[PDB]
Amino acid sequence: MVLQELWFGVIAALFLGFFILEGFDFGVGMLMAPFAHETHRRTALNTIGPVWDGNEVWLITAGAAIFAAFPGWYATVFSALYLPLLAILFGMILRAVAIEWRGKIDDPKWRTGADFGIAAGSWLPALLWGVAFAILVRGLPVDANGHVALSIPDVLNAYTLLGGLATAGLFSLYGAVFIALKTSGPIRDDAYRFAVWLSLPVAGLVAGFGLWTQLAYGKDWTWLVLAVAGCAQAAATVLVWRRVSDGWAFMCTLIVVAAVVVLLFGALYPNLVPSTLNPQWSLTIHNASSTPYTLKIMTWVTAFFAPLTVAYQTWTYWVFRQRISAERIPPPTGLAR
Amino acid sequence: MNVVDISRWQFGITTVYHFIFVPLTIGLAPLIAVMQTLWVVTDNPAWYRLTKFFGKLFLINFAIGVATGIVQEFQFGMNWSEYSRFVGDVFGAPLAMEGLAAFFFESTFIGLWIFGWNRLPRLVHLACIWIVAIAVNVSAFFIIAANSFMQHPVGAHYNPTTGRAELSSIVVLLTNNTAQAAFTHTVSGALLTAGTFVAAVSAWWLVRSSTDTQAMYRPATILGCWVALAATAGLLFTGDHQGKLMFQQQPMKMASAESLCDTQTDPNFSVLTVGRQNNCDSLTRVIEVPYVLPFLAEGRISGVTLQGIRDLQQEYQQRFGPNDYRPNLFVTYWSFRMMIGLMAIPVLFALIALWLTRGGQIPNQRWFSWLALLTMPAPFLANSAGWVFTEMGRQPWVVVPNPTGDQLVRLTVKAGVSDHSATVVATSLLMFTLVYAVLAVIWCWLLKRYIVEGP
Ligand SMILES: CC(C)=CCC/C(C)=C\CC/C(C)=C\CC/C(C)=C/CC/C(C)=C/CC/C(C)=C/CC/C(C)=C\CC/C(C)=C\CC/C(C)=C\CC1=C(C)C(=O)c2ccccc2C1=O
Ligand code: HDD
Ligand code: HEB
Ligand code: HEB
């Protein structure tokens, strides 16, 4: 019914916001190591400093929304995909403590461990989430009883591995244009240097994964979404060679990330956990959803707090909209080891 | 061990690690807001340094508090898929509603408070820490109400058409008597953890300074001790509200804190009991203090009858079928002495610190400095023991049947577990334990480095 279909887009929007906001957060994390090849690492980290916690909650809200709206969907994907999600949590945990504790102790060995935690919390989520969403679009061996009995080839195949590399490459390009917009000076120039190198290889991964999803699982209306992604990617590709705009460059890359979420969720409709053995046993938005009263009660709460959440989250980015340079970085106030 | 036992330990060890930093975060956030508010009103630079000093320690605890809660959000679907489906229509609403009403606020405004000292106005920056101080309490309420549905399910029907419990009224679920009693008790428990933490650190510096900084840590010692004493009074009142609820909702758990075996009128509360407490028949009681269990069960010292564990064992078999409804007697018994006994150290420390700081006096005793250090872990361990008794006391019920509610709305831990293998859960349990253990050591070391360093 209506509420069942409406909440499918609300969960997709929560994952949409997670990919838009945490997408460049992951890109910053995997671009700190090539920046050195200390001041540049801190400048890039401070771009996502006051927003990394808020950005992350979108994944937490999306995960809890699924639990409340579609209890069967929550208890199937997170149960079947136990191993890929285990490494996602492992990285996230390290990044949640490495960002805050990096500047607590002034010691090169202390920061080396903190950089690993940030890298672990930015590489694994960038790679595995693309695989996790590719698995859902491809499907899972769900039987009539609801069990999955996941196997190795059902996770690491040609389609899922391409999706993981595409999202990780897109996030790296997403973080490259985000730093170039939030920084100025030599650090901004280095962001465009990697953006050019991450322009063509990433575009092929996104186009290849997008075309594969469209030709195998996409619908008729999803062709426009792929066309927008292609146009956005081509616009974003040419906006980095010549740095005419930072915002346009970031906005065009934002559309590419947004179009991937719509394309993945557009193909994952109305099925939530497609069954590769029998499509009748697949989990849909009708046989795995909650009652209308629960979806109704959650609708009023979502319609009040989700628009309110974007109100101050956007204002939070407006407060720290000023670009930060190497001269604006405060001296390291870390204790001796 | 089997899959169920390994999954029980994993959901236990990780979330116990989570409740090491949560009670400090809940109580300390209003405390720093108080110090920052006093700095704005009184224009006292002493309160500004207290805000920067204890605020620094809060951020170290806040970062690891977020990390330890990430797994718990998806842990329900990973290791308790069967349990997630049964109560997803009811249990998922408090978890999701806390995401947009408390998690989005306390995570977005915490960044504004850290990086907005010189960018945001003083009035606006002050409200940022107050929103975080409120959102942590809001998050505690919804996450406790969801757990209170397990302890006392209300506003839900079985709906035998499908094998899951379905929500009937959201108001009844949020206004549960167990939810309100446990929320106010945990918040009072969190205030004691932070109140003792502020008082102990400030009192530790008073002796160190004597052996202005003294001017600065003395007001914090007074504020921390009175908050701990106020939290102790709240813990007694809310603890008296909770025991009564426990009596009529979970008779097994009420007798679990006593290891009661037969239905006796006005039982004696035993401080100590020897043995592993397997069978319970041979238990030995030491220092039996009367007028305690009657007062906690029905609120009256005399005339209260409590059903024994043995008596309740056969009673539950006649309604829920043949099963082992006996919780872990050894764990629940000693985890209950622990929650209660661990009041003396914090309360004892608060009383002494206030006596040594009367009339502007600055303490300088060496034993007082050592007393504060040993007082710091007492509320942290007491909070851990309080929730452990709540979770091990309801075994083997993951969803305790409501005596006055729907009988069919219930589930066991074994029937709520997922269908993983013994090696997959063990690998996750092993990697969860070491990663949290390393971070816990770093978290403890980071606090020690900044406490001795000071401003
Ligand atoms: C005046 C005074 C001293 C009063 C208190 C002393 C007193 C009266 C009694 C306590 C002393 C005695 C004899 C026994 C202890 C009672 C007892 C067993 C209490 C419960 C244990 C408890 C609360 C432990 C606190 C843990 C804690 C905060 C440790 C420090 C923090 C750190 C760094 C690590 C701890 C996390 C860790 C590695 C393991 C956590 C394990 C714990 C505590 C709970 C989890 C857990 C337990 C305990 C099970 O028994 C169990 C059984 C079946 C399935 C699952 C589980 C399960 O998950
Ligand atoms: C009574 C308090 C309390 C209890 C019983 C719990 N939590 Fe918690 N949780 C907190 C109180 C809290 C908090 C105090 O509000 C924290 C700690 C620091 C923080 O940022 O929020 C937190 C953080 C926190 C976060 C980080 C969100 C963010 O800020 O980015 C998540 C995802 C969870 N929790 C989830 C859970 C789940 C799924 C629980 C049950 C299994 C749980 N918590 C038990
Ligand atoms: C969300 C809601 C919730 C919550 C809040 C919580 C909160 C908590 N918790 Fe919990 N749990 C749960 C839900 C929950 N929970 C469950 C469901 C389970 C399953 C059942 C069993 O296993 O028992 C558990 C289980 C559990 C355990 C194990 C036990 C056994 O098994 O025997 C433990 C130890 C714990 C602790 C804890 C704590 C400490 C806390 C504080 C933080 N836990
Ligand atoms: C701060 C620390 C602490 C403390 C001190 C305390 C102190 C106390 N306490 Fe407590 N708890 C706690 C922490 C605590 N606590 C907790 C955490 C818990 C869990 C949650 C709830 O509320 O439930 C409890 C819970 C609880 C309860 C309920 C149980 C169930 O339900 O399961 C009761 C009855 C009580 C009583 C009491 C008392 C009487 C006292 C006096 C001694 N406790």
Author numbering:
A (entry chain B): 1 to 37, 44 to 343
B (entry chain A): 1 to 211, 217 to 460
Sentences from the paper on this structure:
In this light, new lines of evidence point to a crucial role of the cytochrome bd oxidase for mycobacterial pathophysiology. This quinol-oxidizing terminal oxygen reductase is encoded by the cydAB gene cluster and is a central component of the branched respiratory chain of M. tuberculosis. During infection and proliferation, the cytochrome bd oxidase plays a crucial role for mycobacterial pathophysiology by maintaining aerobic respiration at limited oxygen concentrations. The cyt. bdMtb is structurally characterized by the presence of a pseudo-symmetrical heterodimer formed by CydA and CydB. The CydA subunit represents the catalytically active component of the enzyme complex, harboring the three prosthetic heme groups, and the quinol binding and oxidation domain (Q-loop).
Cofactor assembly and oxygen reductase activity were validated via UV–Vis spectroscopy and oxygen consumption measurements. The three-dimensional structure of POPC nanodisc reconstituted cyt. bdMtb, in the as isolated mixed-valence state was determined by single-particle electron cryo-microscopy (cryo-EM) to a resolution of 2.5 Å. Despite the close structural similarity to the cytochrome bd oxidase from Escherichia coli (cyt. bdEcoli), the absence of a CydX subunit homolog neither affects cofactor assembly of cyt. bdMtb, nor does it influence cofactor composition as shown by our cryo-EM structure and spectroscopic data. The cavity that harbors a stabilizing UQ-8 molecule in cyt. bdE.coli is absent in cyt. bdM.tb. Instead, we identify a series of Trp and Phe residues that occupy this space. They form stabilizing van-der-Waals contacts between TMHs 3, 4, 5, and 8 that render the structural quinone unnecessary. A distinguishing feature of the mycobacterial Q-loop is the presence of a disulfide bond between Cys266.A and Cys285.A within the QN region exposed towards the periplasmic space. Our simulations demonstrate that the disulfide bond rigidifies the disordered Q-loop segment and reduces flexibility between QN and Qh1. We conclude that the confined conformation of the QN-region sterically hinders an interaction between substrate molecules and the highly conserved Glu263.A which is involved in quinol binding and oxidation in immediate proximity to heme b55816. In proximity to the disulfide bond, within the cleft formed between TMH 1 and 9 we identified a bound menaquinone-9 (MK-9) molecule. The local environment that forms this previously unknown MK-9 binding pocket is composed of the heme b595 porphyrin scaffold, Arg8.A and Trp9.A of TMH1, and Met397.A of TMH 9.
